[PDB]
Amino acid sequence: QLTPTFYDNSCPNVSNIVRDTIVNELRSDPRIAASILRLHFHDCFVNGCDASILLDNTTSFRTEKDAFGNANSARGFPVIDRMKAAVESACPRTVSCADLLTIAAQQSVTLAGGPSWRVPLGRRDSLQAFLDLANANLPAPFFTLPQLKDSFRNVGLNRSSDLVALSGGHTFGKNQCRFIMDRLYNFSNTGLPDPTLNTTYLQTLRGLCPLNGNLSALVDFDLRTPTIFDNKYYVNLEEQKGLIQSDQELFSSPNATDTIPLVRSFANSTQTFFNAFVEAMDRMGNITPLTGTQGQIRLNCRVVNS
Numbered sequence: 473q474l475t476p477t478f479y480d481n482s483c484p485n486v487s488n489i490v491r492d493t494i495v496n497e498l499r500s501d502p503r504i505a506a507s508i509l510r511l512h513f514h515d516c517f518v519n520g521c522d523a524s525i526l527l528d529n530t531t532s533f534r535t536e537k538d539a540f541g542n543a544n545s546a547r548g549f550p551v552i553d554r555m556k557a558a559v560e561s562a563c564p565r566t567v568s569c570a571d572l573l574t575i576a577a578q579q580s581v582t583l584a585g586g587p588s589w590r591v592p593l594g595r596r597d598s599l600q601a602f603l604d605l606a607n608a609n610l611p612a613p614f615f616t617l618p619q620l621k622d623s624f625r626n627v628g629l630n631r632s633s634d635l636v637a638l639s640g641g642h643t644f645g646k647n648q649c650r651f652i653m654d655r656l657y658n659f660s661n662t663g664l665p666d667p668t669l670n671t672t673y674l675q676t677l678r679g680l681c682p683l684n685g686n687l688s689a690l691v692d693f694d695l696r697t698p699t700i701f702d703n704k705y706y707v708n709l710e711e712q713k714g715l716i717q718s719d720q721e722l723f724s725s726p727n728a729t730d731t732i733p734l735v736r737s738f739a740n741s742t743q744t745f746f747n748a749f750v751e752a753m754d755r756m757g758n759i760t761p762l763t764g765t766q767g768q769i770r771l772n773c774r775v776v777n778s
């Protein structure tokens with residue numbers, strides 16, 4: 473069983489070392505908190521939160537970094553290396569990369585203004601990476617609500633609250649134009665924009681992402697508070713201002729009878745959202761972890777110990 477006090481004796485300063493690393497990085501890269509939270513999400517959705525995503529290529533297995541959902545998208549790996557080195561110095565061979573990334577995600581959320589809580593710990597590191605599983609398990613922005621629900625259920629998160637609350641991770645961070653081009657100019661081969669996208673916001677997005685323009689250009693997930701972790705993400709959905717298809721579907725899908733009330737509840741109360749986010753985050757962090765003597769305490773998060 474995972475427990476929040478796992479390192480209280482072996483490395484009581486781990487959370488502080490992680491926080492310091494992120495605070496320092498945020499000065500030069502204001503996007504790092506969002507990036508780190510996302511790394512944890514992509515770690516947990518592939519064989520569980522086992523730091524499998526941090527592994528680099530080997531001649532026996534491919535890195536998850538080349539998955540469709542990670543390639544030219546996932547970022548912040550060197551920052552994780554930095555905090556890992558710092559933690560290894562303070563507490564040699566004690567904190568797993570899986571746990572380190574979980575703490576980093578929570579601290580990132582808190583630093584960005586979100587809730588503060590102690591995450592369950594005791595996870596251990598994978599002995600391999602899973603590229604095919606990552607391509608199969610990571611959801612995509614073009615997924616329908618039924619597909620989003622399927623993706624979450626596939627990894628063990630059955631609750632619509634899990635999906636609606638965790639999607640709140642899009643209250644900050646960036647998204648490439650490439651992922652919304654269809655919504656802006658030709659949605660579902662209709663030759664028309666996605667009707668669930670507010671027409672005024674549509675104009676703004678078209679200006680940021682012109683047809684035949686730079687598909688790698690970045691746009692903010694939350695037009696209200698781009699870098700602050702808050703419940704504004706849901707207020708946007710209520711106004712048809714969710715950035716990607718998967719965001720807006722939580723409020724506009726024909727299958728959203730169960731998610732609409734959740735979106736409203738989170739938009740109406742920061743407390744309700746924050747409580748749900750912590751609850752869902754801990755559930756996601758409890759997805760098929762390696763514990764006890766299973767796996768290792770990886771020394772270099774990029775390679776399995778030898």
Ligand code: HEM
Binds near residue numbers: 638642
């Ligand atoms: C429900 C399905 C989800 C889909 C389809 C999805 C999709 C995406 C996409 C397309 C991007 C843009 C990537 C890029 O342009 O490079 C992204 C970024 C991001 N996602 Fe999600 N996401 C989902 C769930 C989540 C969850 C559960 C979290 C975390 C709790 C999360 C946190 C983030 C963050 C913070 C970013 C910004 C990262 C950065 O700026 O570096 N996402 N997501």
Ligand SMILES: [Ca+2]
Binds near residue numbers: 517518524
């Ligand atoms: Ca993983």
Ligand SMILES: [Ca+2]
Binds near residue numbers: 696702
């Ligand atoms: Ca925000």
